[PDB]
Design a protein around this ligand. Structure first.
Ligand SMILES: [Mg+2]
Lengths: 253, 253, 253
């Protein structure tokens, strides 16, 4: 059976260790994240086609104060160590969850959404439309009797590449700059990421500057172009992302 | 920012002035429709890409007694003045609303559906499936905290062309004639419209004859062909449109 | 009007004679299935494009003890007598119904699902999402005031070919053998069926061996290959089909 490294990532409190313990059972071990004493849990389970190494990522609300759990998930996410991500998403706080989701999706990392706590969503009287959600995100959405798990495993095997949906609608000025920023960036990172990194820099993401290399000192002269062409830049971006999530939610829940 | 002329159209009582006042705020003015003393409200708002001139069309149940509100919406709709239409649709009377919708869709006018009064639909215990509705119509469907509006604006920018769905299933005889009628028609009107006009003439739409030009006096000899090949013609057509709406509704609500 | 032979097939008790009596009214007659005294009801109704000969198939839970109702539906299904199938499916026992459905879909027979007893599903508090169901199955799904019937008729005309969805996710070893089995099989049966037949043989379907011809005595040496490569074979297959239905249901109901 083929090897596959999957990252497990989600918001804190959103059922991420439950999923990990059910998937790996006993075939798990605990180490520390390199250089720190933060715990790194790792595990293995078998799908029809793969033998999967599942790495439990620290629980987080955003990829971009700073935080160590945060620097860890992000650093790992940008490393390419992972062939694919299982994004555990709490159905009963769907909007706040999709924030992390969209980031993974604009990065372009092959992603399977594991939609949980669907019992609480019923009580609280929320219904998500699974497959409408899958169509807007561009990636399979699996609702979790060990059913969800089997369905989740199969999706890991069958899913290869998220659809390119251009999910956020940005001012054209903004994209022009994120792009001009993105060519000052290391060949070492894929295209979609360099775009995302370009946009993060225009948002005031300080952290991201350290991922940008050659594009640190071009933010000021990029902030040159936009002043003409526009602005409120970090404003337009946060907003665009906020409109994109608010509209999926109103369409699917 | 780019200019874009959008028509606003819907059934009376279906929340069409509310939407118009929210979109344009104060940047509106009132004139009269050319040649009459019927009020024509016009307004402007800004999307990410466009500066939109919104023209409020008289409220109507059908494009095809006669009526002046009716002659006005239709005349404007066939003029091409409008780059795009926002079709305000009352969720709580979805079937009766889609009648106007289908007409716009068989005409081929780039169309964004604004699905409102979703509060009344809840109480009355109706749920519409937004994105299944969007897939059957071939055009974005936006459910309206100023959320819906932002989602509506973004769709105006992103939507270019309705999908060609062949939505109504017609007897082949019927289409043969609507088509033979449609070549007797002015180069000045697009293909989809000339087909629609051909069909309207076979339905007994008297009004449409004045849009047909050269194809007035061919209805009798078109009604020649169908007598052989079929009939009940105005019957088959009204019915086909009625089946098409009834099946979308049963599939999405 | 064009001729079209449709088979009507479903589980017992799932409303299959009601649908048949409504579609054909009085234009029905009763005969016996060739060689037996089992009743074969046949009927005719008119669609917009076709004049349909509807043949009522014995009610059944599976295509693959043995049974005569069972041998009859299957034999007819593999004969190609039918240009298309109307699969009547009880919404209130959706999972148990889809078992028969999947078999038709892996065979590749142009299929229209007629989704009934939607009243009982409401009471029992089940909602099916029609068009999400249609998208996963690869075939139109029509929910049945003579509405459903009209919508059903139109779909018969418009539907030509199920989408190829590879619905069940099989171990690659399994498919390798079902395929090697499938070339030992008569040119007389289409590709998708010979694959299905290959898989049925590896499942312990005894009945299917008589459809396989030249591939009877290769099951033992096919069971050669898999022992190496795997196993639990009939296990993996039944399971794969069970996961596939369980995941559609969790996604659409
Ligand atoms: Mg849906």
């Amino acid at each position: 059976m083929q090897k596959l490294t999957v990252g497990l990532i989600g918001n804190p409190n959103s059922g991420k260790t439950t999923l990990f313990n059910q998937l790996t059972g006993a075939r798990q071990r605990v180490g520390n994240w390199a250089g720190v004493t933060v715990e790194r849990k790792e595990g293995i389970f078998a799908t029809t086609d793969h033998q999967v190494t599942l790495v439990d990522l620290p629980g987080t609300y955003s990829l971009t104060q700073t935080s160590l759990d945060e620097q860890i998930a992000c650093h790992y996410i940008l490393s390419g160590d992972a062939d694919m991500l299982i994004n555990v998403v709490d159905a009963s706080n769907l909007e706040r969850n999709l924030y992390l989701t969209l980031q993974l999706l604009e990065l372009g990392i092959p992603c399977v959404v594991a939609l949980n706590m669907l019992d609480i969503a019923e009580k609280q009287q929320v219904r998500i439309d699974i497959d409408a959600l899958a169509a807007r995100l561009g990636c399979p959405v699996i609702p979790l009797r060990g059913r969800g798990i089997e369905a989740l495993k199969i999706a890991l095997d069958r899913h290869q590449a998220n659809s390119d949906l251009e999910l956020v609608h940005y001012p054209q000025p903004l994209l022009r700059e994120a792009d001009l920023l993105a060519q000052q960036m290391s060949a070492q990172i894929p295209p979609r990421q360099r775009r995302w990194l370009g946009l993060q820099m225009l948002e005031g993401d300080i952290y991201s500057r350290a991922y940008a290399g050659d594009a640190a000192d071009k933010l000021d002269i990029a902030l040159a172009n936009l002043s003409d062409e526009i602005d409120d830049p970090a404003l337009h971006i946060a907003d665009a992302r906020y409109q994109t999530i608010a509209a999926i939610c109103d369409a699917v829940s």
